């Protein structure tokens, strides 16, 4: 597990600077190696469809730093079973709106990453408004990240600006539920739309190393490793 995952990433890092290089050196990361020889991802966030359907339309989005960005905005009432590390949850969202995120308790790194990744994934208006600094990042291979991966990187590193822009509400009163604050502790207020439940939520190729479905929609790639 430890030696395997590290070995998978090291092959992909050198191959991108690409599919033909990765197969020769061989002969999230390990799933790309298996697909080359013979679940939707957004960084560490793993998603699986529960309900609804999404459709992507390009829009010019004003974001909080004053720039206008061309972003593939998804439309439709949707629900996803989500996971980041050991943290499990259910995400309900619509066009540029996180409507509800029900999660289980986990180590704080995973709870925080799940919440941030879901806020970014939702394309919520408040998340776009929370950008302050520069978001043009070039990745390890010298490639400019797409707008959605720029926001992921930005907010994973600067989470405090997001949460204060996101806002808070009174925590739910149901016995199995509690709220979660900005420090990822149980709280009588909660990040808007987010709740923690004590009830265990159940468990679940392109030349540039991007895995594709039969329809066309890509499920994971190099940016997710």
CA atoms within 13 A on the CB side of 209: 27
Q: How far is the CB of 178 from ligand BYB (least distance, A)?
A: 27
**Is there binding between residue 72 and ligand BYB (CB under 6 A)?**
yes
Given a contact cutoff of 8 angstroms between Cβ atoms, the answer to whether 223 and 148 are in contact is no
Q: How far is the CB of 36 from ligand BYB (least distance, A)?
A: 19
Residue of the chain from 15, 105, 123, 171 that contacts ligand BYB (CB under 6 A) = 123
- Pick between residue 182 and residue 224 the one whose CB is nearest to ligand BYB: 224
Site string for ligand BYB, 137-156 (x = CB under 6 A): -----------x--------
Span from 72-80, 109-117, 154-162, 201-209 in contact with ligand BYB (CB under 6 A): 72-80
Span from 6-14, 71-79, 84-92, 131-139 in contact with ligand BYB (CB under 6 A): 71-79
**Is there binding between residue 78 and ligand BYB (CB under 6 A)?**
yes
* Size of interface with ligand BYB, in residues (CB under 6 A): 12
Site string for ligand BYB, 26-65 (x = CB under 6 A): --------------x-x-----------x-x---------
Residue of the chain from 86, 169, 188, 217 that contacts ligand BYB (CB under 6 A) = 217
Can you tell me the distance from the alpha carbon of 62 to that of 34, in angstroms, rounded to the nearest whole number? 39
Can you tell me the distance from the alpha carbon of 105 to that of 126, in angstroms, rounded to the nearest whole number? 25
- Pick between residue 104 and residue 123 the one whose CB is nearest to ligand BYB: 123
Residues that bind ligand BYB (CB under 6 A): 40, 42, 54, 56, 72, 74, 78, 121, 123, 148, 217-218
């Amino acid at each position: 597990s430890q030696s395997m995952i590290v070995a998978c990433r090291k092959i992909i890092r050198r191959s991108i600077v690409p599919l033909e290089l990765a197969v020769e050196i061989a002969n999230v990361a390990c799933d790309i190696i298996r697909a080359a020889l013979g679940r939707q991802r957004f960084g560490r966030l793993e998603l699986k469809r529960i309900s609804g359907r999404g459709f992507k339309n390009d829009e010019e989005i004003l974001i909080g730093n004053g720039t206008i960005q061309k972003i593939g905005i998804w439309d439709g009432e949707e629900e996803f079973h989500v996971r980041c590390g050991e943290c499990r949850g259910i995400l309900k969202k619509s066009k540029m709106k996180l409507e509800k995120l029900l999660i289980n308790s986990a180590k704080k790194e995973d709870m925080r990453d799940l919440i941030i990744l879901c806020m970014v994934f939702s394309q919520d208006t408040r998340m776009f408004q929370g950008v302050r600094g520069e978001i043009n990042f070039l990745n390890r291979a010298g490639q400019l990240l797409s707008p959605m991966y720029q926001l992921q990187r930005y907010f994973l590193n600067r989470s405090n600006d997001l949460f204060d822009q996101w806002g808070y509400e009174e925590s739910p009163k149901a016995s199995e539920l509690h709220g979660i604050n900005e420090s990822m502790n149980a709280s009588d207020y909660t990040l808007k739309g987010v709740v923690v439940t004590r009830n265990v939520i159940d468990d679940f190729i392109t030349k540039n190393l991007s895995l594709i479905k039969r329809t066309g929609e890509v499920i994971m790639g190099a940016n997710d490793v």
